[PDB]
Design a protein around this ligand. Structure first.
Ligand SMILES: NC(=O)c1ccc[n+]([C@@H]2O[C@H](COP(=O)([O-])OP(=O)(O)OC[C@H]3O[C@@H](n4cnc5c(N)ncnc54)[C@H](O)[C@@H]3O)[C@@H](O)[C@H]2O)c1
Ligand SMILES: NC(=O)c1ccc[n+]([C@@H]2O[C@H](COP(=O)([O-])OP(=O)(O)OC[C@H]3O[C@@H](n4cnc5c(N)ncnc54)[C@H](O)[C@@H]3O)[C@@H](O)[C@H]2O)c1
Lengths: 230, 241
C-alpha cells in the first residue's frame, strides 16, 4: 500500500536488459509512469513497448548517460510526456577487473560512466523532483564498492565513490524532499553465497521498489547489499 | 504482492509498545499469525487482542528474553498455537548512556539483554524455520552500533555486536533457508532538544514507529528473499544524538 508508486514518474537508465529492465517493468506495475532509457535505442523502445502492452505507461528513449545532451533530452522527454519527475534510477554503469597498470583513460572512464553520469542526472532531476513535492533517487552500485581485491582499482574505487556520493548528497537534497539510496547487487542470473542460489533481476527490482516507495519515506543515505548474504 | 507475509508465523519480542507493537500490528495486517511477546504480559495480550479485533490472528504471552525458560516457552507456544515458526523479530532490548566506570553488572547486562537473548532465540527458532521451508530473522539494533560517542561503552558496543552477529550468522543459517538482517533505528518518536536532532536530519522530521515497521515488513517478506546479512539504518538521512 505504501509499497506502491501511484502517480509516480520514474526515469530508469540502462533499462534495456537485466536489473534496469526488471526495475522499469516492476515500477510500471506498481503504478509509475516510466521513462525507459538505454544506450541502445531499440532495447529501450522494446521494454517501453512491452510495458505498454501489459497495461502500463512508458516511453522509450536512447540515452548514453555520459552524454550531456542525451541526459537533458531524457529530462525533457519525461516532462513533456508525463509533466513531472519524482523517481530516478541510475542503473546504467559498468566496468570490471583491470590490471593495476591499465591506461589512465580506462581508470578515468570508470568514473565518467559509474559516477559523473548519475551525479549529473541527479543534478538535472533534483529541481523537478523538488517542484513535484519530493522524490527518490536510487543508484545501482556494486559489491566491489565495499569489497577489496586485486584488479579493482577503477571498478572498486568508482563504485565506492557512488556509495559515498549516495551517503553525502542525501544531506544536500533531503531538505528538498528527496531521498537518495543505493543498492549493491550480487551476481545475477555459490560457496560464498549463504542462500545457495544466484540472484534474479527481480530480486534487485523488489528492493528498488521498496527504496523508491513511500514505504521507505524516512530512508535516505543508505547502501543496501542484495547478494544472498555473501 | 511480494510484500505480504501470507501463511507466516512471526514471533515479535518487546512488542507491547513502540517499534515492536507497530511491527506486530503491521505483520498481522500483511497476513502473518503473530505471537506477541513482552516483558509485561498484559501489554502483550492487549496488542494481541487489538490485532484480533482488527481481523488478524495473534496471541500474547509474557517473555523476559533474558530468561531461558521464558525463551523456550515462547518457542513452544508459537508451535502449539500456529504449528510452525517462520519469522523472528528480536525487538526486545534496552540500555543507553552509561559512565565509563559503571558497575560491571551494568556492562554485562547490556550484552545479556541486547545480544545473548536474541542469539539464543535465533538458535531455538532456526531448526523450526528450516522445517517450515525457510524463514527470516530480524534484529532491531541501534545507530549506536556504528556511531562512536561518549558514554556508549555498554550500549554502543553491545549493539555493534548485534550488527556483526547479524552479518555472521547469515552465513551459518543461509544454507537452512534462513535470512538474518538488522534494522538500526535513529530517533524514533515513540522543544529545543527536538530542534537539535532535526538539525542533522536531512529529511526534516523525526522517525515514526511505522517507518521501522515498514522496513521490517519488507525485510521479512518474499520481496527480500535474497537479502541477508544486512544492517539497514532508518534515520531520515542523518544521525541524531
Ligand atoms: N550482476 C550484475 O549485473 C551486476 C553486478 C554488480 C554491479 N552491477 C551494476 O548494476 C548495474 C546494472 O548493469 P549491468 O551489469 O546489467 O550492465 P549490462 O552491460 O549487463 O547492461 C545493462 C544495460 O545498460 C545499458 N548501458 C550500458 N552503458 C550505458 C550508458 N553509458 N548509458 C546508458 N545505458 C547504458 C546497456 O545497453 C544495457 O542494456 C550497473 O551499474 C553495474 O555496474 C551489476
Ligand atoms: N529511538 C528509538 O526508539 C530506538 C533507537 C535505537 C534503537 N532502538 C531499539 O529498538 C528496540 C525497540 O525499543 P523501543 O525504543 O521501541 O522501546 P520501547 O520501550 O518503546 O519498547 C520496548 C518494549 O520492549 C519491552 N522490553 C523491555 N525489556 C524487555 C526484556 N528484557 N524482555 C522482553 N521485553 C522487554 C518493553 O516492555 C517495551 O514494551 C530496542 O531494542 C531499542 O534498543 C530504538
Amino acid at each position: 500500500s505504501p509499497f506502491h508508486l501511484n502517480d509516480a514518474v520514474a526515469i530508469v537508465t540502462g533499462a534495456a536488459a537485466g536489473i534496469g529492465r526488471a526495475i522499469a517493468g516492476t515500477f510500471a506495475k506498481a503504478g509509475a509512469s516510466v521513462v525507459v532509457t538505454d544506450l541502445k535505442s531499440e532495447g529501450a523502445e522494446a521494454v517501453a513497448a512491452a510495458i505498454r502492452q501489459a497495461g502500463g505507461k512508458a516511453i522509450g528513449l536512447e540515452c548514453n548517460v555520459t552524454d550531456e545532451q542525451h541526459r537533458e533530452a531524457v529530462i525533457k522527454a519525461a516532462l513533456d510526456q508525463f509533466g513531472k519527475i519524482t523517481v530516478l534510477v541510475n542503473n546504467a554503469g559498468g566496468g570490471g577487473p583491470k590490471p593495476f597498470d591499465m591506461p589512465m583513460s580506462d581508470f578515468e572512464w570508470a568514473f565518467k560512466l559509474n559516477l559523473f553520469s548519475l551525479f549529473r542526472l541527479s543534478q538535472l532531476a533534483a529541481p523537478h523532483m523538488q517542484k513535484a513535492g519530493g522524490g527518490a533517487i536510487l543508484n545501482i552500485s556494486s559489491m566491489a564498492g565495499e569489497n577489496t581485491n586485486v584488479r579493482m582499482a577503477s571498478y572498486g574505487s568508482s563504485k565506492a565513490a557512488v556509495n559515498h556520493l549516495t551517503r553525502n548528497i542525501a544531506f544536500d537534497v533531503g531538505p528538498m524532499g528527496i531521498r537518495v539510496n543505493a543498492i549493491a547487487p550480487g551476481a545475477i542470473k555459490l560457496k560464498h553465497t549463504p542462500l545457495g542460489r544466484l540472484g534474479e533481476a527481480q530480486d534487485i527490482a523488489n528492493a528498488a521498489l521498496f527504496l523508491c516507495s513511500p514505504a521507505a519515506a524516512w530512508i535516505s543515505g543508505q547502501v543496501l547489499t542484495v547478494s544472498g548474504g555473501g
